[PDB]
A paper describes a structure:
Glu82 in the active site Loop (RGGREM) is critical for activity, and we mutated this residue to slow catalysis and capture complexes that were not obtained with the wild-type enzyme. The substrate-free state shows Arg81 is the gatekeeper that controls fatty acid entrance to the active site. The specific activity of OhyA(Y201F) was ∼10-fold lower than OhyA, and OhyA(E82A) was a >100-fold less active. The importance of Glu82 in creating the hydronium ion is evidenced from the severely compromised catalytic activity of OhyA(E82A). It is instructive that OhyA(E82A) activity is not zero illustrating that positioning of the buried water by the α7 dipole and the arrival of the protonated substrate carboxyl at the active site also contribute to catalysis.
Flavin adenine dinucleotide (FAD)-dependent bacterial oleate hydratases (OhyAs) catalyze the addition of water to isolated fatty acid carbon–carbon double bonds. Staphylococcus aureus uses OhyA to counteract the host innate immune response by inactivating antimicrobial unsaturated fatty acids. In this study, we deduced the catalytic mechanism of OhyA from multiple structures of S. aureus OhyA in binary and ternary complexes with combinations of ligands along with biochemical analyses of relevant mutants. We conclude that OhyA accelerates acid-catalyzed alkene hydration by positioning the fatty acid double bond to attack the active site hydronium ion, followed by the addition of water to the transient carbocation intermediate.
Author numbering:
A (entry chain A), B (entry chain A): -1 to 60, 71 to 78, 81 to 591
Write the structure that this text describes.
Amino acid sequence: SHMYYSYGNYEAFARPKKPENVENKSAYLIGSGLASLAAACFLIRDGQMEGSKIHILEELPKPLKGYVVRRAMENHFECLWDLFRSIPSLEIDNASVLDEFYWLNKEDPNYSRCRVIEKQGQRLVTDGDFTLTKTAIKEILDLCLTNEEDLDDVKITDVFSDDFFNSNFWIYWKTMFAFEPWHSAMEMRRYLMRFVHHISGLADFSALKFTKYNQYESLVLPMVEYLKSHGVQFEYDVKVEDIKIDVTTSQKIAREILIDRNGNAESIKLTINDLVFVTNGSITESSTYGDNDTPAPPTDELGGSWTLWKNLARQSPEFGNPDKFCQNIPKKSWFVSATSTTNNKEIIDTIESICKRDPLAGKTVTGGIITINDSAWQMSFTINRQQQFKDQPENEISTWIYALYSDVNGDYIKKPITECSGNEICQEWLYHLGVSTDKIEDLAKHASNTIPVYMPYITSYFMTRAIGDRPLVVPHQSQNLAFIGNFAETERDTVFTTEYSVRTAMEAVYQLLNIDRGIPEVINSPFDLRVLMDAIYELNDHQDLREITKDSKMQKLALAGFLKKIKGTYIESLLKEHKLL
Amino acid sequence: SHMYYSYGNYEAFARPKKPENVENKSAYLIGSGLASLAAACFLIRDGQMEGSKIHILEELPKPLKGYVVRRAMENHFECLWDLFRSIPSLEIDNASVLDEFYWLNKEDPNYSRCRVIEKQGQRLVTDGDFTLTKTAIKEILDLCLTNEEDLDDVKITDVFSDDFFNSNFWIYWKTMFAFEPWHSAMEMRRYLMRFVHHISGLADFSALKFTKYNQYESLVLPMVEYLKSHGVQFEYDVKVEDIKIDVTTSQKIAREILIDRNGNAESIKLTINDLVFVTNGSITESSTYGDNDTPAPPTDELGGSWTLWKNLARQSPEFGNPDKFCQNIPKKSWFVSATSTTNNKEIIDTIESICKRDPLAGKTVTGGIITINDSAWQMSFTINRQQQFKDQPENEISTWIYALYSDVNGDYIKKPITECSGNEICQEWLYHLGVSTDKIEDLAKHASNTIPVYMPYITSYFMTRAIGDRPLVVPHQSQNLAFIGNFAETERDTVFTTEYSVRTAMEAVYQLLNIDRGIPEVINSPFDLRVLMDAIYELNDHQDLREITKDSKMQKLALAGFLKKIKGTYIESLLKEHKLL
């Protein structure tokens, strides 16, 4: 391809030459999403493009009656870090967003003290172990051994059986990633191989890393200062309708950008030197907002994002199939998310007794999400390093809440979550905290300002896709078109991840300009001996190779002959090295 | 330990905090070798130490009747690149030594057009294939499967048999690395695992990378400008005798540095805050020099380096056993190296017709070493990107020559190489180039200025060592002592390598100061599925799994059952992925 993957320090520290003919090129970026911001940043640094020639078109210009909170990173987001190492931070002087992040998660590491709760406040008894049976472990192995071509339109409830589902591993997995039974077995197979190196840190969120303030403040805003420092243009109130593309038998050239600047109908014309970066699709689209007194109105609208993707699919199949992601989303699926802000010391005291940490402390609180396992909504909540907003009073905590089931009645508020307001969500949440039934309706109506948010497309990432549903970053024979974001296709990496946004960003800029530098490959942990032995030891709840085959005569007979061969050699020393012998 | 290994972009780009209490610390560096220069550089950048407090003691101050040339790098010298990414180059403005190196080897890649020659000029017939038989491949596998503890004082002629030795693979291996039959099987086992990822590029030197000018100009001098830019002290004509060390049952503290500054006998006293970095041993020690008319006088002296290592061994076994490296070196071993500089167009024309490239071109010439396979001295030569010296006339080429056998008579100059002058070496070399017997004595005596160099310790790196012969970088319970260089011990990495000098440099600075940053691990290619399948395909001269077992009924029967299991799964698709099915 116009590209090559690499995996070294040689490729990482090196600076690529200024790409040929970039002194006569312009680039247009569709949407102000985090992927576009990264693609524009890559055009500045590595592509050495002019700042006066990078245009970012957004529908938004410059209300809301409360605070709203919008997952964590991990060390091996290899493309996210090549970017923020070059982004000067907004807090600590002469140190990059990486540096401030790097130090902050070393000074205050992340770990969950109470990961799962049940029975209205109590800590889950088997919290820690995976409760994976011999059958469940095998279906995990078979799914990874299953080729990805043999997973077209294959749901998760077709690869696993009961043994896997009634386990803590499924509880830990579906809740930190927001997976659904009817979701793509193709993507979960990617997630299993993607994060096989932190599988020990799955039960306790030890391999997670959070920023200081919220995603806007710590990630988006440092980028925006970097971009405007270089003169990058920010077009506001620009809605993109369609993009005329010439798909000849030889090329694919973009020509027009049919926009609606505020109210006027205009159009930008593109040569072959005018690059276009389309963030096709959006999970944040068509989100409604409620308050502490009214539910967020449920909607199913097609926003300008999907209609933009739709208008390109009717121009070539190679530009993707949007309908598999935004149509036929089960009405049970995740739609509602909430944010309860409160200073009432009795709710913060209740949270303290569960998560074992002072929430009003500036340190870690929950360590991640805390899953109410027996809750009807299958609802989870998290509390990050308060205050999460830079100008929020230093005696308030902001709690993010979501639920995976949206058409079942709550155990206390006997109705679906799409029918509930802020205080009705706040009431069902507090009841599961163990708060007394007497102080439930008051502490939610008058003490906590809970904001519910309905997004009809939040699970569009994980829909059951097929080979060809997601478009390539740079389609075959394309000259100035690129698709970025989590509905673009690349190799092995996982969507619903800020890494995926910066991956397809860095792959789009590097291909269209042919930059003489390698792109960091998805970490090779799934092909690493040492990482895979660790997975077998951790999947079996810390059992050596003898204890795993002590009840199988057909297995313990094959192992005994295996140990005879590798006895006294590197393999046997590598097997005690990773606790397997 | 005081340390942790890491393998990511997260750890690579990040800057570590200023180590505690470094504002009251001093460091002393023993010798001006490349390892010390790196340790001092690491004290400046990562340790944030003062420049006025880094002392580099050297025996040399500020003749020689000719030019002298002193191996190549590879992409996965993970510690060498964390260093030069921060070293400003001396040629291209505002670009580091890494950058100028990175671009230079992309603009002009390296590859050997004629790797082995024989029969006085002709190209070897089987050049390319490994000629590894089924037995030879297995001894390779067994040696790696052999634990490293089971290799104490084990020579190379005890792990391999005849089948391995009469092969091109042995010819390619012993000559680019300067291995000997009687050398350590422990280190070759490390070399096999170290470079298992470039095994395809072993026959053609395609994975090699050279600098522009010589090692002094392109590596040492950029470092020295960086160090003196920060005020690092350079003590010249300082010979270090002994270093008094307090090895109590609890600690190991250095106290005195017994030196001989020029002629005076002085001594520096060390608190626990005065760090010491000892480059224990030296292959360059006690080197004599000849000219085009007289042989370099053979010597066996103990230089101030070995006597310094000796004086520390009589203070603790944990500081190493120097005698295994500098005593009992076989008199057949490599000692003589040469450098033939000439402008005579008939010698450069002869080289052109063999290496297939214009030597007087500024590009690649030989691509690496060219081995004269049937030569008595087992002599090899290389010609790098002339001119290799910054102020050398643009019509001269400088040819480096060495030989592995030093007590056998040459095929033309019927005497050992330790008896030969510059022109006698130049005559034996030209005879093997195919130059006519008539124009052999003239073109070497009057056309070429060949300088012979005798170093009695060049093969000290690869001597048959045992666990405990090489000291740890930071011995147990040590407080201010560190041993750097290729006679220090670390994990998995290989000596006789500029990576090893910068590895133990970066490990010494990071442990003594406890820097909050990981050290890049030796590349995990020997534990990488994809890299190991590639090795089996490349070791068998590009044969798939069917052709490797077509003559073994006990093997083809086990494979047929193996292919039944993994059929249609990831493993089988990964096996065509790497040409194995």
